[PDB]
């Protein structure tokens, strides 16, 4: 069996205490990163699944084990795909991480529990976000079905169907699966192969990398004369990387505190690539790879590198402090428990603008009709156009309003 | 079991000094156990004990310095006197007693370890140490400084001797904070370590480095730590990073 890395990024959405990590575990086997130094940087974890098919019935086709002994046929499984999971939490406080996750995602998985109430605002918000950020491949999954009645589940399904009609997602498949009992995952696997294809990707496009997580490889007990370099957990959308290249983290860093800053973006040479489980020479875009570079282990510690752009040497993108946005607003607010009408944008107000993966606070200067000018506090970079989600404050915490695009 | 003589012989001589620990009083005087010559009882009558509250001063537990007058070398009969002892030599006597005590302490570990009689051990020790040199404590001290007295007698147990030596035979904590933002940092850290370690330096997490500096005469630990700090400061300024010292 060949040790091929991740091909396409699949993300999972839900709610707090509903069950997402458990579902992930059921799907794959290797436990999630979340659940001080290691793993702790963002809200998303790290998981990997296997797609191997046995074609020699009905729904039973794909499996989780490398060896086929369970269904009947003793023959070895055929290699189809290998996928990486991006598990994003569905909490009312933390959403920036989710947004960041969304930017890299190519496939989405919705989770709704049976026993709880049918209309949930957070789930709706998530769906809206998915719709916004160039995602159409959505599979609806029912979580807790075993604790529900014979007709109640059907009713719930009907309600769901009624709800999802006017949205961009038209032909979304619905699967009921148990997380604690471990059943019906084969159908899900089959669907993964059926409904979702891999988009065309080539070597010709300029390298662009997005870092979500940060890692320091330091072990207690062992002497200091045996050290390991700083690892940046970064996912790639476009551009193939190989071992032996120069990488730079774009936005900038503060090194001296009197004296104006002039220091260039953080340069680092690649030491070792961590994909799936074992090290590989080539990096195929469409997965999260722990890129171990010559960067400090102290820098890759905690909340320092959350959603930052990474480029290869011989390419020049632009850095902006003032940004030109083309926005579109929604009718009523999504996320609030009660629904409130969206007000027109007022000059000079603190609003959270999420350009791809960056979590930045911006203030409005001029409003016309569709075009808006924003002043940023923390530095941000622009490459092409980018997919932007906008968030405002009305009551206590952040609420989503609509979508935006950079006009440059 | 604790027994055997302190100097050379079981029975004391004439005019020699002995220290006594009193258990019970008021019958004849004090017929109590000795600490300078064996554990055989020595007696004072109610006249030689007083020099100048007579019952209160001694009673139970307290130590007394007394000179030997009458000896009966047959089975164990010693006579003591307190009045004759002069104040000038009392300090000397005390010192001697202390030395004896130390010697006794030294000959206990052996008894404990190899489960053999203490008296035999004492006999084996006293021949080159307590006879040729003078007193035993000084000989022991000499040996510890430069080994010359242990050479005289062959050791039946070297392990015991080693243990004794060990018995006869300062870490200062420091914290250095690392928070670099430069291009290369690991190498710099390694370099720093190569100048700070060579005593014991350990890694805990990522930003904190814990180091323990050993001092010879307690005050010496300040001179090295400061130097190390200076070296660390020198290290990170050139590349373009920062390291802080609390």
Curated annotation (Swiss-Prot), chain A:
This is Eukaryotic translation initiation factor 2 subunit gamma. Its EC number is 3.6.5.3. Residues 5-201 form the tr-type G domain. Belongs to the TRAFAC class translation factor GTPase superfamily. Classic translation factor GTPase family. EIF2G subfamily. Disruption phenotype: Inviable. Residues 87-90 are annotated as: G3. The chain holds residues 94 to 519 of 527 of the full protein. It catalyses: GTP + H2O = GDP + phosphate + H(+). GO terms for biological process: formation of translation preinitiation complex; positive regulation of translational fidelity; translational initiation.
Curated annotation (Swiss-Prot), chain B:
Phosphorylated; phosphorylation on Ser-50 by the GCN2 protein kinase occurs in response to low amino acid, carbon, or purine availability. Phosphorylation inhibits the guanine nucleotide exchange factor activity of the eIF2B complex. It holds the Pfam family EIF_2_alpha. Residues 15-83 form the S1 motif domain. Gene3D superfamilies: EIF_2_alpha, Nucleic acid-binding proteins, Translation initiation factor 2, subunit 1, domain 2. It is found in: Cytoplasm, Cytosol. The modification Phosphoserine is found at residue 50. One of its GO terms (cellular component) is multi-eIF complex. Changing residue 50 to A: Inhibits derepression of GCN4 expression in amino acid, purine, and glucose-starved cells. GO terms for biological process: formation of translation preinitiation complex; translational initiation. GO terms for molecular function: ribosome binding; RNA binding; translation initiation factor activity. Keywords: Cytoplasm, Initiation factor, Phosphoprotein, Protein biosynthesis, RNA-binding. eIF-2 functions in the early steps of protein synthesis by forming a ternary complex with GTP and initiator tRNA. This complex binds to a 40S ribosomal subunit, followed by mRNA binding to form a 43S pre-initiation complex. Junction of the 60S ribosomal subunit to form the 80S initiation complex is preceded by hydrolysis of the GTP bound to eIF-2 and release of an eIF-2-GDP binary complex. In order for eIF-2 to recycle and catalyze another round of initiation, the GDP bound to eIF-2 must exchange with GTP by way of a reaction catalyzed by eIF2B. Belongs to the eIF-2-alpha family. Eukaryotic translation initiation factor 2 eIF2 is a heterotrimeric complex composed of an alpha, a beta and a gamma subunit. The factors eIF-1, eIF-2, eIF-3, TIF5/eIF-5 and methionyl-tRNAi form a multifactor complex (MFC) that may bind to the 40S ribosome. Interacts with CDC123; the interaction is direct. Interacts with GCD1. PANTHER family: EUKARYOTIC TRANSLATION INITIATION FACTOR 2 SUBUNIT 1 (PTHR10602:SF0). Present with 17100 molecules/cell in log phase SD medium. This is Eukaryotic translation initiation factor 2 subunit alpha. It comes from Saccharomyces cerevisiae (strain ATCC 204508 / S288c). The lineage of its organism: Eukaryota, Fungi, Dikarya, Ascomycota, Saccharomycotina.
């Amino acid at each position: 069996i060949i040790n091929r890395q991740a091909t396409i990024n699949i993300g999972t959405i839900g709610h707090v205490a509903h069950g997402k990590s458990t579902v992930v575990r059921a799907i794959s086997g290797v436990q999630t990163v979340r659940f001080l130094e290691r793993n702790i940087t963002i809200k998303l974890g790290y998981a990997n699944a296997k797609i191997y098919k046995c074609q020699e019935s009905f729904k039973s086709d794909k499996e989780i084990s490398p060896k086929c002994q369970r269904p009947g046929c003793p023959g070895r499984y055929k290699l189809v795909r290998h996928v990486s999971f991006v598990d994003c939490p569905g909490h009312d406080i933390l959403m920036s991480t989710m947004l960041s996750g969304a930017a890299v995602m190519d496939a989405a998985l919705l989770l709704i529990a049976g026993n709880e109430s049918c209309p949930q605002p957070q789930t709706s918000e998530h769906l809206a976000a998915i719709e916004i950020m160039k995602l159409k491949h959505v599979i609806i999954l029912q979580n807790k079905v075993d604790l529900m009645r014979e007709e109640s589940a059907l009713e719930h399904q009907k309600s769901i169907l009624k709800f999802i009609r006017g949205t961009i997602a038209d032909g979304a498949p619905i699967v009921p699966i148990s997380a604690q009992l471990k059943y019906n995952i084969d159908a899900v696997n089959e669907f993964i192969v059926k409904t979702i294809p891999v988009p065309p990707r080539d070597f010709m496009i300029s390298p662009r990398l997005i870092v979500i997580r940060s890692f320091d490889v330091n072990k207690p007990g062992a002497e200091i004369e045996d050290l390991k370099g700083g690892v940046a957990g970064g996912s790639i959308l476009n551009g193939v990387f190989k071992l032996g290249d120069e990488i730079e983290i774009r936005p900038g860093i503060v090194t001296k505190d009197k004296g104006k800053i002039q220091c260039k973006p953080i340069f680092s040479n690649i030491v070792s690539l961590f994909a799936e489980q074992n090290d590989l020479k080539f990096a195929v875009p469409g997965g999260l790879i722990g890129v171990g570079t010559k960067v400090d282990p102290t820098l890759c510690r905690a909340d320092r590198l959350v959603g930052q752009v990474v480029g290869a040497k011989g390419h020049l993108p632009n850095i902006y402090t003032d940004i030109e946005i083309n926005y579109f607003l929604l009718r009523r607010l999504l996320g609030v428990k009660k629904q409130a009408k969206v007000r027109k944008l007022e000059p000079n107000e603190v609003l959270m603008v999420n350009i791809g993966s960056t979590a930045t606070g911006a203030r409005v200067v001029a409003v016309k009709a569709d075009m808006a000018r924003l002043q940023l506090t923390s530095p941000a970079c622009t490459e092409i156009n980018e997919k932007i989600a906008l968030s405002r404050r009305i009551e206590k915490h952040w609420r989503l309003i609509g979508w935006a695009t950079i006009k440059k | 079991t604790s027994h055997c003589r302190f100097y050379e012989n079981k029975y004391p001589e004439i005019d020699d000094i002995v220290m006594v620990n009193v258990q019970q009083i008021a019958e004849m005087g004090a017929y109590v156990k000795l600490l300078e010559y064996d554990n055989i009882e020595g007696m004072i009558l109610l006249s030689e004990l007083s020099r100048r509250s007579i019952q209160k001063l001694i009673r139970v537990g307290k130590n007394d310095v007394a000179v030997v007058l009458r000896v009966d070398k047959e089975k164990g009969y010693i006579d003591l006197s307190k009045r004759r002892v002069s104040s000038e030599d009392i300090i000397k006597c005390e010192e001697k007693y202390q030395k004896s005590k130390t010697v006794h302490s030294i000959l206990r570990y052996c008894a404990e370890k190899f489960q053999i009689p203490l008296e035999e051990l004492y006999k084996t020790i006293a021949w080159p140490l307590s006879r040729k040199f003078g007193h035993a404590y000084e000989a022991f001290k000499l040996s510890i400084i430069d080994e010359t007295v242990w050479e005289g007698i062959e050791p039946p147990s070297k392990d015991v001797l080693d243990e004794l030596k060990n018995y006869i035979s300062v870490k200062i904590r420091a914290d250095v904070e690392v928070s670099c933002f430069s291009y290369e940092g690991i190498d710099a850290i390694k370099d720093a370590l190569k100048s700070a370690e060579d005593v014991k330096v350990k890694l805990v997490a990522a930003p904190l480095y814990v180091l323990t500096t050993q001092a010879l005469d307690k005050q010496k630990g300040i001179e090295q730590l400061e130097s190390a700090i200076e070296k660390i400061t020198e290290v990170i300024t050139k590349y373009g990073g920062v390291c802080n010292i609390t």
